[PDB]
Structures are given as structure tokens and as C-alpha cells.
Amino acid sequence: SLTDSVYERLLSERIIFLGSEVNDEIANRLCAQILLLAAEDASKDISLYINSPGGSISAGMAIYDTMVLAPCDIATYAMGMAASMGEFLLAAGTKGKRYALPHARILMHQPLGGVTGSAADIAIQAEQFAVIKKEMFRLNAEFTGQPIERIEADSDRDRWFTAAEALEYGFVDHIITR
Amino acid sequence: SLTDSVYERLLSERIIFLGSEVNDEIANRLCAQILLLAAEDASKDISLYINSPGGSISAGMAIYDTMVLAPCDIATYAMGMAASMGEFLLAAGTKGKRYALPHARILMHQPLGGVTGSAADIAIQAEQFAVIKKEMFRLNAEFTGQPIERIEADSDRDRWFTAAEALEYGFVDHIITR
Amino acid sequence: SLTDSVYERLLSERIIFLGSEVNDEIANRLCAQILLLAAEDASKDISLYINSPGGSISAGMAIYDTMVLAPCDIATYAMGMAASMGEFLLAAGTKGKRYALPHARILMHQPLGGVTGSAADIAIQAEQFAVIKKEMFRLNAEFTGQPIERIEADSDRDRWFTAAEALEYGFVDHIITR
Amino acid sequence: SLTDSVYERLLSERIIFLGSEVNDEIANRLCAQILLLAAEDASKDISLYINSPGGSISAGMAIYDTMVLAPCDIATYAMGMAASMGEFLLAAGTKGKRYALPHARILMHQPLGGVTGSAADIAIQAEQFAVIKKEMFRLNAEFTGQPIERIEADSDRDRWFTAAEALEYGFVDHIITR
Amino acid sequence: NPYNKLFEERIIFLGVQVDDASANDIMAQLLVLESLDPDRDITMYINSPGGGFTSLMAIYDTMQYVRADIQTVCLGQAASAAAVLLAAGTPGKRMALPNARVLIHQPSLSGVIQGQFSDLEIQAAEIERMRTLMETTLARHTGKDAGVIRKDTDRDKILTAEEAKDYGIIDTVLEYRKLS
Amino acid sequence: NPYNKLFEERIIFLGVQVDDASANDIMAQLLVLESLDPDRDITMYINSPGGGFTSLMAIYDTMQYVRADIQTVCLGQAASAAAVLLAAGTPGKRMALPNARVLIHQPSLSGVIQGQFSDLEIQAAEIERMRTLMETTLARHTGKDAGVIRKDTDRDKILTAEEAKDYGIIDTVLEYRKLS
Amino acid sequence: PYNKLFEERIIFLGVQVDDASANDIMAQLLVLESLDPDRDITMYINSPGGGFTSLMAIYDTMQYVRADIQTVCLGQAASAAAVLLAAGTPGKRMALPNARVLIHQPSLSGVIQGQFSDLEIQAAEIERMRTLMETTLARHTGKDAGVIRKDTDRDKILTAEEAKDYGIIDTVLEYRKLS
Amino acid sequence: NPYNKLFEERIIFLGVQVDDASANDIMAQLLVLESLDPDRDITMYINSPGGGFTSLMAIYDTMQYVRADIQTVCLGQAASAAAVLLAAGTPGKRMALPNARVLIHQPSLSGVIQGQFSDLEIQAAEIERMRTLMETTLARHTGKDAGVIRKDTDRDKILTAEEAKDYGIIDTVLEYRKLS
Amino acid sequence: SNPYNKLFEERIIFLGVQVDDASANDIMAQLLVLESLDPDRDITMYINSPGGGFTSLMAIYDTMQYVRADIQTVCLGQAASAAAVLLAAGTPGKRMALPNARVLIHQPSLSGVIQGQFSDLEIQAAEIERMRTLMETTLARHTGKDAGVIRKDTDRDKILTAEEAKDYGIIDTVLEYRKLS
Numbered sequence A, B, C, D: 001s002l003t004d005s006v007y008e009r010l011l012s013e014r015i016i017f018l019g020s021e022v023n024d025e026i027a028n029r030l031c032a033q034i035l036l037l038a039a040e041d042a043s044k045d046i047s048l049y050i051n052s053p054g055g056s057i058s059a060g061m062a063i064y065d066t067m068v069l070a071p072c073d074i075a076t077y078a079m080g081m082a083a084s085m086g087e088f089l090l091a092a093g094t095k096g097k098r099y100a101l102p103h104a105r106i107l108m109h110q111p112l113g114g115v116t117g118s119a120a121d122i123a124i125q126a127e128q129f130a131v132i133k134k135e136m137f138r139l140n141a142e143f144t145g146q147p148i149e150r151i152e153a154d155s156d157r158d159r160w161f162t163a164a165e166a167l168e169y170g171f172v173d174h175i176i177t178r
Numbered sequence E, F, H: 001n002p003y004n005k006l007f008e009e010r011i012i013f014l015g016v017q018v019d020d021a022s023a024n025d026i027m028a029q030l031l032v033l034e035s036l037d038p039d040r041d042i043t044m045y046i047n048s049p050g051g052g053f054t055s056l057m058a059i060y061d062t063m064q065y066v067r068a069d070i071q072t073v074c075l076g077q078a079a080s081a082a083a084v085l086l087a088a089g090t091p092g093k094r095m096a097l098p099n100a101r102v103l104i105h106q107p108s109l110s111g112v113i114q115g116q117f118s119d120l121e122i123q124a125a126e127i128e129r130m131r132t133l134m135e136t137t138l139a140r141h142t143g144k145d146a147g148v149i150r151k152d153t154d155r156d157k158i159l160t161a162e163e164a165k166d167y168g169i170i171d172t173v174l175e176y177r178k179l180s
Numbered sequence G: 001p002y003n004k005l006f007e008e009r010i011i012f013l014g015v016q017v018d019d020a021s022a023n024d025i026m027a028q029l030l031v032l033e034s035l036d037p038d039r040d041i042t043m044y045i046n047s048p049g050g051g052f053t054s055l056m057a058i059y060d061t062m063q064y065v066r067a068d069i070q071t072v073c074l075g076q077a078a079s080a081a082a083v084l085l086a087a088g089t090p091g092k093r094m095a096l097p098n099a100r101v102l103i104h105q106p107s108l109s110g111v112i113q114g115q116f117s118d119l120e121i122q123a124a125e126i127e128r129m130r131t132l133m134e135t136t137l138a139r140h141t142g143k144d145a146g147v148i149r150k151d152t153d154r155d156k157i158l159t160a161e162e163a164k165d166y167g168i169i170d171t172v173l174e175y176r177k178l179s
Numbered sequence I: 001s002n003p004y005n006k007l008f009e010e011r012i013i014f015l016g017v018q019v020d021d022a023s024a025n026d027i028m029a030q031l032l033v034l035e036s037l038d039p040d041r042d043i044t045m046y047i048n049s050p051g052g053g054f055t056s057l058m059a060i061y062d063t064m065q066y067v068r069a070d071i072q073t074v075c076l077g078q079a080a081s082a083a084a085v086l087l088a089a090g091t092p093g094k095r096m097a098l099p100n101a102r103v104l105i106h107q108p109s110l111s112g113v114i115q116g117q118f119s120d121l122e123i124q125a126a127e128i129e130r131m132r133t134l135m136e137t138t139l140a141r142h143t144g145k146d147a148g149v150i151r152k153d154t155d156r157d158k159i160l161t162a163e164e165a166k167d168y169g170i171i172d173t174v175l176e177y178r179k180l181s
């Protein structure tokens, strides 16, 4: 393809894209790309440009674990939109290497889901939703450097950030302007 | 493909196309192409020909940030239609290098969206719609050189421009006629 | 593909095809092909064979602007059907190089559209429909050499032409018979 | 493709992905990859990274049998999500080589199915559901080292594990943190 | 209506698919006719394709509850649940027209019901409880041994009325009043 | 109608899926019969597949509110919501026909309801409040300990009428008036 | 049986509060005002709510009539129906002991599209609807509207015994027979 | 019906979406009440979401035609056409309940209507004729200057009843007869 | 009694809905009953219709021309397509319309595509020109126009206000309100 050819040539320059909703297909693609790029050069940075409306928690936790366990530093770039799991994986970049493009918008909000089934199933899902939401807030508190009480308060409904507000809040480390 | 082969050969001549609705897939393709072309030659111009009915704000802000942070000058070309995000990315080109083909039409209008959910969610969406619309009008005021009050007044409903009217208004810098 | 391979080999012989409805995808393909062929040889003619039921005004205005601003002469060929934007881009060819195949049919009619939204939106759409229809009739008057009053009268409803009637009317310059 | 190209280059580095629902198409792909990688080098480990929401029992039993009968050690990696057949094939890895990424979540639950048809058909399906559930619990008891009574009790409804809880329970052997 | 004239002469009418709507109507019809004349026989006309086991056993228990003897008459079809209701009439009664089609078969699930294997162990213990109850019910009304009912309702067993009398579903094949 | 003859002899009739339409009818029927004779017993026929918890507790509270004792009778099925209404009758009452199917199980959500995790923490605290209320209600009407109800309604618990009497859902299995 | 309830001056909400259901109840409220303006109209509520202008159509009519409104929650008063439950007369507003009162802020069912000037107004209206829902549920519950805003931030399901403590109802309705 | 008691006391009732079905009913109701008492006031209750311009001007012209003064009363909503009909009542009349929602906005096309640009030049000259007529009608009934109506109905203008009185849509906000 | 029954008792037929085979058959039944009740007292016809249907038009048209009673057509909010022809089809000295009524005349159309061989479509087009010429001939002896003026004017949608449907000849008087209000 053309779009796959431009992405392959930027994969050669160690630039990968989270450019859609973080589902398992895009996550396993990025996890494969981070494993492929950490196998080629384990010392050069991987540039993850994030134009993402968010996505699955477990799909983005696959990416986040592959970002952390890569010996490369994952430079993340908020490009237009880093919402939900996009803001998570943005803030999950290497400290000092989390960038916002100056008109990127950052959406931190608590996870979406759905309960279904019997009341014993839903009691397990909500027990697990409390586990997922506590760990998602713990990591956003670890990434941004904010308290987990402030992360839980701000990420109660949609909490939008500009690039300057995300720099103050702690999702990104720099706003690049070249 | 054929269409991908002609686009790849114009990518080699540093000519990229915004030829559809600006969604995240076309934006991440163009952002990848601008990053690929700025990596090859950081001093040659990139010609972005825009035949676009508009699109997502955050997708076009990804393109606009990639256009600005590219060391290349992004020559933009209104080709037939530059509505919504198409007029934005047209006017987002390098000053002196924003071109309208003589029968291109330019549509500047305020952003479309949708409110949904509870009244506390909608109060956040409208708070963010006021942020998006103020920054979209600020940048169209910066691009065209018009006041932000005139941009807000003219882009209240659909405001159509010919190539000559867009030259007077400030979206393009030249009407090329060869 | 096969169909893409035959089109690519005719692209090498500078023969391009408007063979479907003129939407933005086919227009951006043809605009890319005219830009690609004008970059290879800026002095050899491009043969645009048109089997088209018409299409979008702004998509065909993208093609028409790329046809005019190409340093090549765009030889156009009515092949079976040049209706709506197909007749426009046929008559938009280089004078002396607009051809009708002897059983091609030419359909000149005023543009189709749709009004929607509030009455202030529709007042803008109809203001712009009067702009589009005046410029579409002005260019068909420029192409055919007919008065704009005759173009407006004949292109009020569907006005069909044979190859001989389109030669008299002015859409084509020759009926080729080899 | 791009995604197939990154997977092929990790197939060359003996890294395969269970990255979706375990149906017969993904199982026959993985079974083919394990047979292909055990034919190339019968002594190097195969890294199976599992981002899976579960799937078919018989599809995952195809993978599990191909994992066991491969002379390679199948290193399994819980990457984000190892639910149902994903937790099974995770725990089905070589002992000492079952890894959880530190934010992977493990979902052990009894198999889902559906009864249909006449009451003599359903009596056979439930006879076979008792066979499938006993062998699925026997193997999870063999993998984790837990008693089959504890596997049957915990995997009665959804039983979620973090990476640390799955290490204590016995699905994984290490939590890798690099 | 012509149905109202039938109900006035104490003829309930099955007619349609045995479901929760049809079972609730017939039980209302059976109890009203028990209250009107508890000693005069209710006649039950059956042209039903059956279906529904709890709708079966709602109709079945009610026509067994009422003091009035139930004269079941199969019209053109008593398939599935409706054949159990046909056998559910009083002995010395239970007519069927000569070209009626009695169809007995084991209970089924219409479509797939999903769930965990503990959920499906119970939906299968119920469909065997439904099967055993359908064979136990069709044994004390046909005089068979339930195990014979299980072997015969293993598949669709279509009975002609003349061989539904030999089977014990009905007791007499209904002779025509005029030859015509 | 035959239903009007049942209602004239003070028999409300559940019959259908317990929803907002069916609960509103039965509460209208329960209060009219309280106004007609507050000392004569309302009989409730139950052939319902259940469903709906607020429609359950609308019917439940109304049949507990009225001065007339409620004689619940299970016809072919009382499946959740309807099995709670079956136990909701007066002690010394609550019949069921011998092949009735009493089905008790914990409350569910029909389909997925989406939302933020704070929205779903509340939809789950409610479905546990619905579950605990369903087990508390089915404990003072069955004599069980609510924890036994929670262990038994963990899955679908289908009760035959003879073992819904042993469970405390009903008090007597309804003998037939004629053998037939 | 509904006609016997209406003959004894009991209107019956019963269904989803929409334009069809609000128009019926307002017709029922005004007829019973004309029959006996001094005898109390009773309102039975088993509704899932919904609809704000259908709410405030029922709300204003049951506030307009001279007859005091005795609201009774049957199994559910949700969204618009819990506001109608609090809308009864003080010293009235019963609820059955297992009734489910559900108060939450107004929502848009589905997405409504438009320009950002159109959506600035559809959001100023849903905040006007929210503030009116909290102002209405404050003079009928005795709360401070800001407490109503903090409590209806999410779904607030009230049991009848704690909808009495909240001020939605005034008494939890004791059964006439134990049974 | 309760609606028949309202119509007997000369209250027409808009209630639903203003379309060809609803406009034809109200015009039939307006002319019957003109024939019954031409000197006694017709009351019009409006809880409508509006819609339809020729259905608006069918109702509008009829309530202007009849000799009886029209007392419009907004119930919960007078949106679009409904708000023009609300202003269309007699001066010294036109009540609205205190939490009524008056919504004025310019005419729209529900969905896209296709055609040639000569067809769409006429469908747009009509929607501007519909817009100007909606603003001319809402100017002699509100006392505004039509150009103020055009600037205000540029978007959705939701009016509370207390500020629809200041706007001229209604003349008094309807006080409650009992505090409650 | 319905309010429509009170209108029909005072000899007012009511078009109201889309002119189709269901609506035309009702109005013809209403026109002939009122001819039988009083053949000398005028039938009033209220028109709020979007039109449509040509044989349903000419079924209503011929019946309201057949009856001995003069037809007083009154346009309520809309007379479009077939309904504007029925509005002009009333008796001269009659044919009122309310002041904000919308009279819409346009040439006949085919709702959707009808397929077929070109000999089938030559006949479906000779019929739609026979329908067009009949619609213009009918709307010429009721408006006083020359059918060729009707053809030039109904080339597109011609929306007439009631004050300019009186100048066009569709109606004869714009109906003054009995009270100012």
C-alpha cells in the first residue's frame, strides 16, 4: 500500500504511530513494532506519535508494558488528540521525552465500560472495574506526578487539556515548537 | 495499486494530497508523509494539494502541527475544494506559499459537533466547544490576517469564497494560473 | 491488479481515464496523474478519455484546474458518455484537441444538489448554488463558444448531444474516425 | 501489509502473537507458526505473546497441543490480557518461561457455550460440556499447580488476576520488569 | 363469533401455537367452564403445532384440575405439546378426526441459549426434566411404559389418528356423521 | 371475556412478562378487588416468565398492601420476579399446579448498560441492592435465611412444585379435582 | 380497573413520561379539578421518567390544580417521575416500602448534531433543564439545590425509607395487612 | 374521554407534533366551536414540538379566522410552529404555565431535498418565504420588528415563560390556583 | 360525533391528507352522498393536502365537477400538486383560500423509477405527457390561462401565496378573517 509504505519507512526511522482507537489489533501491531525496534537497536529512541481517541484499557496496557520493557526510550508525541488510552500512553512515555504538539488536545477521563449478565457477574465486573480504575488512576498519578486524589477528581468526567495545560498537569514534558 | 502508485511517485516529488475528509486515518497518513518528507530533505518544499470537504478538528490539528513543526515549507494548494479543515490546512500553509487554483472554492465555517450524555457531560463538551471554536478562530485570524471578530462573524454559518475572494480574505497568497 | 496494470501502462503512454462518476477519489487520482505526467514530460499531450456520468462540481473543478495549469495540452476524448462533469471536463480540454468518439453522447445539464438545514443555511446554499451555476455556465460558454444565455437555456434540463451535435455546439473540436 | 510485515519479522525472531480471540483461524495460524518455527530451529525458544480475550476451547487446544509437541520451549507472555483461552495458553507455556507483563490481567473462568436442539442432543452436549470443563480444569490445575477443586471453585465465574496475583496463583512463572 | 357459540356449548379451542398467550387463554376458558357447569364435559379442539413446555403443563394441569371431564378432539394436527394435551383428555373420550396428524417428539430448545457450562448443565438438567416429565405424562395417559415413550419420541413420531388410537394418544377415531 | 369472569370471582391473572405494562394492570386489579371486598381473598394466577425488578416490587408491595389475602397459584411457570410473586402470597395459601415450574435466580441486566465506571459502580450497587432485596423478600416468605437464598439463586434454580413446597415458595401442591 | 381508579380520583402515571403520557395526565388532572376541586387527586407513579418538557407539563398542572396531589410511588420513580413524586403536596407523597426512587440530572437521549452555536444553545438549555430540575426538587425536598446538584451528579437510587429522609416522599406506606 | 370534557368546555388541545394529521384535527375543532358558540372563547392547550409550516399556517389562519377569541396556553413546550401558534392567540390572553418552554427558531428542511439548481432555487425561495412569513407572523403578535425576530430566531431561542412574556409570545405567566 | 362528522353534516368534505387511491375514494363517496342529501346546497371542500396522484386527482376532479352542488374549495395551509388543481376545480365565485395558504402547482412526476423496455417507456412517457397536458388543460379552464402559460409556469414548482393565487386564477378570493385577534 501507500499508507503502509510511509509507515514502514517511518518504522525504519523508529517512528511509530498510535493513530486510531486503541483496540487489540492496533495494540498488537504497536507491541510488535516496539519489540521489533527494540530488537534492531536497543539504544535508539522510539518515537510514538499519538493521534488517538482512546481505546481499550488492556490493549493500551499491552502497549504500556511493551513501552516500559523496551530498553529503548519511548518518546511519545501528542499529535492532535491523546484521549483516554491515548493520553495514558502519551503520559506513559519516557520522562523528559513526552511531547505535545502545540495544538494537541489531551482528554483524561475515567474508563468506560459496560456491565451485563447476572448480579453475581456484575458484582465481579464492578469489583474489577474498581481494580482497573484504581490502577489507571495510580499510573496517571505516577505519570503526571499529580496525587491520585487529584487524578481521581479531575478524571471523573471528561477533563480536557490543551498542550500548555497538559504540560502544567504533567502528561507531557515539553511542547515542541520548531 | 494504481492510485497508490501515482501518489507514491508524487510523494517522491514531495507532493502530498489531502484529497478526502480529514479523519484520523487521512491525518495520520499525511502526518506520516510530512514526517517522512521532512526526514528526506529538510529544505525542499512539500506541496500539499487540498481537495477536502473538511473533517475532524483534532485530525486537522495533527496535520497543522506536523506542517508547522516540519522544517520544510508546506506549500498548500486549494484544488477544487477546501471546506472546513480543508480551508484551515490551506490557510495553515507557509505564508507566500498558500495557493488557490483559480476555480477552487473555500468554505470557512464554525466547527460542527454533537452534544450527548448527561448535563454535566454536555457542560464539559460545550466548555470544550468554546475552547475549540476560539482556537480555530484564533488560528484562522492568524492565517488570514483578519481580526478574530471578523473570523467569528463570517464563520458563523457557511461562508464561501472563490479563489479571488480567498485571496482578498487571506486564506491563500497567490492564485496560480499557468 | 489487471485493470490497474492496463491503466498504468496507458499512464506510461500518457493516456488517463475519467471512467466513472467524478467524485473526490477519482478527481484526486486524475489530478495526481496530470501532475505526474506534467512532471515527466511538460510538452507531450495527455490524453484524457472520458466515460463519465458526471459528478461533483468541485471534484471536476479540481480536475479542470489541474488540466489548465498543466503545461501539457490535455487532449480530451468523449468515449461513450460525457455527462455533467464529464461533458465539462471534455469541453475543458485544449482547443483543437477535444475529441468525440463518433457514438459518444454528451449530456449538458445544470448542476444537481441538495438544500438542507435551517433557512439561513439554505439561503447561503442557494446563494452559493447561484455562484456555482453561474460559473459552470460561464465556463461552458467559454468552452463551447456559445453565449452564456444559450448555455443557461439549453442546460436547464437534460440536453443530450450526439458526437455530431456536440461538434456543432462546441464541446468537441473533432469527431475522430479511424 | 505493514502489520503482516512486522509479524513476519518477529516470526523470524521466533516471536509469535496470540493477539485476538482464539478462533480456528488464529489457532491454525499459530499452530502453523509453531510448526514452522519448530522446523527451523528445534532448540530455540518460541515467544508467544498473548493479548487475548479468550476464545474457542478446541482452537486453543490445537494451540496447546502444538505448543507441547513442539520440541521448542514456548515462552508465553501475558501482554495486557490473557483471558479464557488466553490464560490457558499463557499457563500452557513452558514452566519457568511463563511471563506476565506487570500490568497484564489474567481472567480464569469456566468455559462458555450454548445448548441447542432436542433434549437428546442437549444431553450429549452437557455430557460433553462436563468432559470439556473437567479437562480444562484439570489442565489449569496442572499448569498453575493449584488443586482441581480450587480451580473449579475460583473459575466458577470470572476470576480476575493481576500479574502479581497470577504469579502467586501459578499462571505465570515470572513478572518481567526491564 | 362462531368461537363464542362453541364456548357457549362448552368447547374450548386450542387452535394456535401453545405459548404463554395461548396457555393463559385456555386456562381462563377451562376455569370459567368449570364454574358454569362443573359436571358437564368441556370439549377441547386441538389444531396446534405445539411448542412450549411450561405453557403445555399450564394447560395440562388445568385440564386435569377441573372437575369437568375434558373431551380432547384433534382437528388436523396435534404436534409436540399439543399431542400431550390430546392424550391429556379423559379416558373414554379423546377423539380425533380421521386425517388428524398426531406428532410426538422430545422437547427441544428453540435456538441456542448461551452461558457458562454450569449454566448449561442446569439448562440441560431441565430439558431432561422436561423430557422425563413429557414422557411420564404421556405414559399414564397412553398406558405405555415411559421407556417406550422415550424410544418412540427419540425422533419425530408422526401418528395417523388410526395409529394414535393404537398408541394410546386418542381412544376413538371420529366417524363422520354424513358420508358426503 | 373469560378473564372478566375470573376477575368477577376475584382472580387476578398475571399471565404475561412482568414489565411496566403488566405490573400496572395487576396493581389496578389488586386495588379494585380490595375496594370491592377487602375481606374476601384475591386469587393470583401466575404463568409468567418474570423479568423486571421494579415491576416485581410494584406488584409485590401492592399484593402485600391490600387487606385481602392473596392466594397465588402457579400455572405452568413462575420464573424469577414471578416466583417471588408466587412466594408473596399469604401463608396457608400459595398453591401451585403439580407440573408447575418455579424458577428462582438472581437479578440480571438484560443487555449491557454502558457508562463511566462511576456510573457502573452505581448500576452494580443497585443490582446488588436488587439482589439483596430479592433474597430478603424471598426469605421471609420461604422461611429461609437469605444466605441460603443467595447460594441457591446463584444460578437458575428450577423447582418442581413438589420441591417448591419443600423450598417454601408454595405451601401446597394443588391436587386435581378429577383424576381424568 | 383504571376507570374505577379515576372515578375515585386516582390518576395513574404508569408509563414512560413522554408527550403522549403527559397529555393524558394533564387531561386527567383538569377533569378531576372540575369534578371536585376540594377533594384530593391521588397520583400513582410507576414510571421510568424521561422527558423534561413532559415532566414540567405534568409538574405545572399538578401544581396548578386546586386539589392537593397525593403522589404514591409504586415500584419506581425515575428521572422525571421522581420529580413528580416530590411534586405532591406536603403531608402527602407516599411511597410503597420497596419503591425505587431514582434521581439524576437531565440527559440527551442520543446525540444531537449541529454547529457549535447550535450546541452552545442545546447545552445552555440542558443546563437550564438541569438547574430547573434541581430548583424544582429543592422546594419540594427542602434541600439547597446545590445538594441536589451534588446528589444528582450520578444516578442516585433512593429506597423509599431513604427517599423519606431525602425529602422526596413524606411517609413510607405501611401495609394494611401483614400477609 | 377527558379530552371530550375539555372540548365540551371549549378547549381544543394541540398536544402532538404539528403535521397534516394534527392541523386537520384542530381546524375541525376550531370551526365546530365557532359554530357552537361564536362569542365564547376557545382555549388552546399547546404542548407541541412544532414542525410543519403549512400545518402551522393552517392552524394559524383558522384560529385567526374564527370569531371566538383564542386563549392559547402553553403547557410544557411551544417549540417552532407551536410557539407561533402560542403567540397567535388573542391579546389579553395567551397564557403559559410557569415552567413552559417556548422555543422559536427559523424554518428548516427536515432532511435533504434533491433536485436541479433551478428546483433548489425555488425550494430556497420558499424556505425564505416561509422564514419571512414566520417572522412577519411572529411580529404582529409579539410587537417586535420582524428584523428583531430574524436576529433572535437565527438559532434556537428557548424562552422561559417569564421571558416569553417579556418577548411578547405570551401576555401573562399563569399563576397557580393552589400553592401545593 | 367527531368534529369531522359535524363538518360533513354541514356539507363540508375535507381533503386533509395525501391524494391517493384511499383518499380519492373517500371524497367521491362524500361528494355523492352530499349530492343525494341536498343537490342544490353547496358542498364545501377543505384542502390541506400535499397532492400527489393523477388518477386520484381526476377521480376527485370529475366527481366534484359531476355533482349538481357547487363546490366551494377552501385551501387551508397547502394545496400542492393534485390538490391545487382540486382547489381551482371549485365553482367560480367560490374557491376561497386562507391568507397564509400555500398553493403549489407543478407538472406531474413519477415517484421513483419505473423500469422497462423502451417501448414500455415510450408509453409511460406518452402518458406522463398526457397527464401533463391534461393537468394544464384542466388548470386552464379553471384559471382562465392559456395552458401554454400553465406549462411555462408549472415547468418548476410554482409556489403561490393566496394573494397571488387569486391573481393567478387558482382561487377567486383570499379569505378575510371574521375576527382580527
Ligand SMILES: CC(C)C[C@H](NC(=O)[C@H](Cc1ccccc1)NC(=O)c1cnccn1)B(O)O
Binding pocket: A022, A023, A053, A054, A055, A056, A057, A058, A083, A084, A085, A086, A088, A109, A110, A111, A112, A113, A114, A129, A132, A136
Ligand atoms: C483509558 C480510559 C481511562 C478511558 C477510556 N477507556 C475505556 O473506557 C475502555 C473502553 C473500551 C474501549 C475500546 C474497546 C472496548 C472497551 N476500557 C476498556 O477497554 C475496559 C472497559 N471495561 C472494563 C475494562 N476495560 B478510553 O477508551 O476513552
Ligand SMILES: CC(C)C[C@H](NC(=O)[C@H](Cc1ccccc1)NC(=O)c1cnccn1)B(O)O
Binding pocket: B022, B053, B054, B055, B056, B057, B058, B083, B084, B085, B086, B088, B109, B110, B111, B112, B113, B114, B129, B132, B136
Ligand atoms: C473545520 C471546522 C471549523 C468545521 C468542521 N470541523 C468540525 O467541527 C469537525 C466535526 C467532525 C468532523 C468529522 C467527524 C466528526 C466530527 N471536527 C471535529 O471532529 C470535532 C467536533 N466536535 C468537537 C471537536 N471536534 B468541518 O471540518 O466540517
Ligand SMILES: CC(C)C[C@H](NC(=O)[C@H](Cc1ccccc1)NC(=O)c1cnccn1)B(O)O
Binding pocket: C053, C054, C055, C056, C057, C058, C059, C083, C084, C085, C086, C088, C109, C110, C111, C112, C113, C114, C129, C132, C136
Ligand atoms: C456538472 C453539473 C453541471 C451537473 C452535475 N453536477 C452537480 O451538480 C454535482 C452532482 C453531485 C455529485 C456528487 C455529490 C453530490 C452532487 N453537484 C455538486 O457537486 C454540487 C452540488 N451543490 C453544490 C456544489 N456542488 B453532474 O456532474 O451530475
Ligand SMILES: CC(C)C[C@H](NC(=O)[C@H](Cc1ccccc1)NC(=O)c1cnccn1)B(O)O
Binding pocket: D022, D023, D053, D054, D055, D056, D057, D058, D083, D084, D085, D086, D088, D109, D110, D111, D112, D113, D114, D129, D132, D136
Ligand atoms: C476458554 C475457557 C477458559 C473459557 C471460555 N470458553 C469459551 O467461552 C468458549 C466459547 C467460544 C469462544 C469462541 C468461539 C467459539 C466458542 N468455549 C468453547 O469454545 C466451547 C463452547 N462450547 C463447547 C465447547 N467449547 B473463554 O474462551 O471465554
Ligand SMILES: CC(C)C[C@H](NC(=O)[C@H](Cc1ccccc1)NC(=O)c1cnccn1)B(O)O
Binding pocket: E049, E050, E051, E052, E053, E054, E055, E056, E079, E080, E081, E082, E084, E105, E106, E107, E108, E109, E110, E111, E127, E130, E134
Ligand atoms: C412435547 C413437547 C414438550 C416438545 C416441544 N416443546 C419444547 O421442547 C419447547 C420448545 C421451546 C420453546 C421456547 C424455548 C425453548 C424451547 N420447550 C420449552 O418450552 C422450553 C422452555 N425453556 C427451556 C426449555 N424448553 B413441542 O411442544 O414443540
Ligand SMILES: CC(C)C[C@H](NC(=O)[C@H](Cc1ccccc1)NC(=O)c1cnccn1)B(O)O
Binding pocket: F049, F050, F051, F052, F053, F054, F056, F079, F080, F081, F082, F084, F105, F106, F107, F108, F109, F110, F127, F130, F134
Ligand atoms: C426476582 C428478580 C431476580 C427478578 C428477575 N428479573 C431481572 O433480573 C430483571 C432483568 C432486567 C430487565 C430489564 C432491564 C435490566 C434487567 N431486572 C431488572 O428489572 C433490572 C432493572 N434495572 C436494573 C437491573 N435489573 B427475574 O429474572 O424475573
Ligand SMILES: CC(C)C[C@H](NC(=O)[C@H](Cc1ccccc1)NC(=O)c1cnccn1)B(O)O
Binding pocket: G049, G050, G051, G052, G053, G055, G078, G079, G080, G081, G083, G103, G104, G105, G106, G107, G108, G109, G110, G126, G129, G133
Ligand atoms: C427529572 C429530569 C432530570 C428528567 C430527566 N429527563 C431527561 O434526561 C430527558 C432525556 C431526553 C429525552 C428526549 C430527548 C433528549 C433527552 N431530557 C429531555 O427531555 C430533554 C429534551 N430535550 C433536550 C434536552 N433534554 B431524567 O432522565 O433524569
Ligand SMILES: CC(C)C[C@H](NC(=O)[C@H](Cc1ccccc1)NC(=O)c1cnccn1)B(O)O
Binding pocket: H049, H050, H051, H052, H053, H054, H056, H079, H080, H081, H082, H084, H105, H106, H107, H108, H109, H110, H111, H127, H130, H134
Ligand atoms: C415555525 C417554523 C419555524 C416551522 C418549523 N419547522 C419547519 O421549518 C418545517 C420542517 C419541515 C417539515 C417537512 C419537510 C421539510 C421541513 N418546514 C416545513 O414544514 C417545510 C415544508 N416544506 C418545505 C419547507 N419547509 B417548526 O419546527 O415548526
Ligand SMILES: CC(C)C[C@H](NC(=O)[C@H](Cc1ccccc1)NC(=O)c1cnccn1)B(O)O
Binding pocket: I051, I052, I053, I054, I055, I057, I080, I081, I082, I083, I085, I105, I106, I107, I108, I109, I110, I111, I112, I128, I131, I135
Ligand atoms: C396536479 C398533478 C400534476 C398531480 C401531480 N402528481 C404526480 O406527480 C404523481 C406522482 C406519482 C405518484 C405515483 C406514481 C408515480 C407518480 N403522478 C401520478 O399520479 C402518476 C401516476 N402514474 C404515472 C404517472 N404519474 B403533482 O405531483 O404535481
